[PDB]
Every structure is written in structure tokens, then in C-alpha cells.
């Protein structure tokens, strides 16, 4: 409500592991954590793309034009523009 919660790559990337599962679409870090099991789909494919790369996992799906908005209630935030001034150049590495 005031601000970008830029999170790095590294912070995301621990989120996996129990409960708190994030999941990233387009430069956006979407928070899942309560949208697991009341994700329409199961639980787990979510967790299939947790703290990294879901953007291409999830826009082939082609959900619908009504429910990828919803998404956005969800945005705990996005890419930290340090690593993310970077997108520019993938060369990622590392």
C-alpha cells in the first residue's frame, strides 16, 4: 500500500520448503502461501515453480481474461531492481 516489496532472487528462492511457497509471474512475486490447496488445480503444481520461474508455467496454462487479474491481490511485491536492472542482459549469470 505504499510500496514495491522488492524482494531478491535469493529471498525467494528459500520458499519452498513447508508452508510459505511463493511464486513469480512477469517481474512480480505473487505470494500463494493461502492459495495452495484452494488453488482450482491441486496444491502441488504451484509448488512445481516455487521461489523461481513460474511466468512461463503459468501464462501457456491461459487461465482465462477474468482470474489472472485476481492475481493481483496476491503481489507481495516483485524482482529487486538491483538483480533486476540486470534483465537487460541475461547473461544472468549467475
Request: aromatic share 8%; charged share 35%.
Amino acid at each position: 500500500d505504499k510500496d514495491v516489496k522488492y524482494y531478491t532472487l535469493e529471498e525467494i528462492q528459500k520458499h519452498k520448503d513447508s508452508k510459505s511457497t511463493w511464486v513469480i509471474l512477469h517481474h512480480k512475486v505473487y505470494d500463494l502461501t493461502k492459495f495452495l490447496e484452494e488453488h482450482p488445480g491441486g496444491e502441488e503444481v504451484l509448488r512445481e515453480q516455487a521461489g523461481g520461474d513460474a511466468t512461463e508455467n503459468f501464462e501457456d496454462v491461459g487461465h482465462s481474461t477474468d482470474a489472472r487479474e485476481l492475481s493481483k491481490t496476491y503481489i507481495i511485491g516483485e524482482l529487486h531492481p538491483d538483480d533486476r536492472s540486470k534483465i537487460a542482459k541475461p547473461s544472468e549469470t549467475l
